[PDB]
C-alpha cells in the first residue's frame, strides 16, 4: 500500500534485470524492411521471429528466482505450457512500445499478408490494442511474463506446490505495485488479471492454426 519490502524489491530487481536483457537483432529488423512482400517471405520472417522468441524465453525464465530449483521435467513442462502465452505478451509490448511507427506498420502489413486467417489475426490485434489501453509499465510487463511462465496449473507438472510457492510472491508484488502507482484506480490489478485470461485463449487459436509452405518442423515439435 505504501512501499515494497527489501525482499520484494530484490525479487523485482532480478525479474527486471532478466527482462531488460532482450533485444531484437539487426538481421531480423533489416528483413522486415528489405525482403519481398510475398506470402512466402512474410511467413518466413514471422517463423524467424517466433524461433528467436523461444531462445529469449528460455534465457529470461532460467534467471527467474527459484526456476533453477524446480525439478528438470517441471522446468520443461512450464516452458512448453507458457511458450505461446509468453510470445503474445512480448509481441504486445514490442508492437505498443519498442517498434518505430513505420517499421511496426510494415510488420503489421507482413503479418496480415502471410497466409494466416483473419480468425487468428483479428483476436491478435484486438489483444494488442487491449494491452495498449492499460498503459503498462516495464515492471508490469516483466511481472506479468513471470506470472504466466510460473503457472502451477500447466499440464504434466509433478510438484505443483513448488511452482505455487514461486508464483504467489509475484502476484503479491504486482498487486502492491498497483496500489502504489494507481491508488486512485482500485480496479487496476483486476484489469491486469483480465489480460492473463485473454492470453489463455491464444493456446486454442495457435493449436488450431498449426493444424493447417507453412510447414515448420522445428517450432511444431516445441509447441505440440
Amino acid at each position: 500500500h505504501m512501499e515494497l519490502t527489501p525482499d520484494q524489491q530484490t525479487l523485482l530487481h532480478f525479474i527486471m534485470d532478466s527482462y531488460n536483457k532482450q533485444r531484437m537483432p539487426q538481421e531480423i529488423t533489416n528483413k522486415i524492411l528489405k525482403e519481398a512482400f510475398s506470402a512466402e517471405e512474410n511467413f518466413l520472417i514471422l517463423t524467424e521471429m517466433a524461433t528467436n522468441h523461444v531462445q529469449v524465453l528460455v534465457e529470461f525464465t532460467k534467471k527467474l528466482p527459484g526456476f533453477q530449483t524446480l525439478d528438470h521435467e517441471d522446468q520443461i513442462a512450464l516452458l512448453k505450457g507458457s511458450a505461446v502465452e509468453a510470445m503474445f505478451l512480448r509481441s504486445a509490448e514490442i508492437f505498443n512500445k519498442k517498434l518505430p511507427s513505420g517499421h511496426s506498420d510494415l510488420l503489421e502489413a507482413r503479418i496480415r499478408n502471410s497466409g494466416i486467417s483473419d480468425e487468428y489475426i483479428t483476436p491478435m490485434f484486438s489483444f494488442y490494442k487491449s494491452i495498449g489501453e492499460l498503459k503498462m509499465t516495464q515492471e508490469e510487463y516483466a511481472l506479468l511474463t513471470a506470472i504466466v511462465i510460473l503457472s502451477p496449473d500447466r499440464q504434466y507438472i509433478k510438484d505443483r506446490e513448488a511452482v505455487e510457492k514461486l508464483q504467489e510472491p509475484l502476484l503479491d508484488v504486482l498487486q502492491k505495485l498497483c496500489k502504489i502507482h494507481q491508488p486512485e484506480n482500485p480496479q487496476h490489478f483486476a484489469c491486469l488479471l483480465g489480460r492473463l485470461t485473454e492470453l489463455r485463449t491464444f493456446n486454442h487459436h495457435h493449436a488450431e492454426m498449426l493444424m493447417s509452405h507453412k510447414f515448420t518442423p522445428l517450432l511444431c515439435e516445441i509447441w505440440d
Partner: peptide
Amino acid sequence: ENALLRYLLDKD
C-alpha cells in the same frame, strides 16, 4: 524427447 528445450535450458 524435448531436445531443443533441454539444450537451451542446460547451456552456458
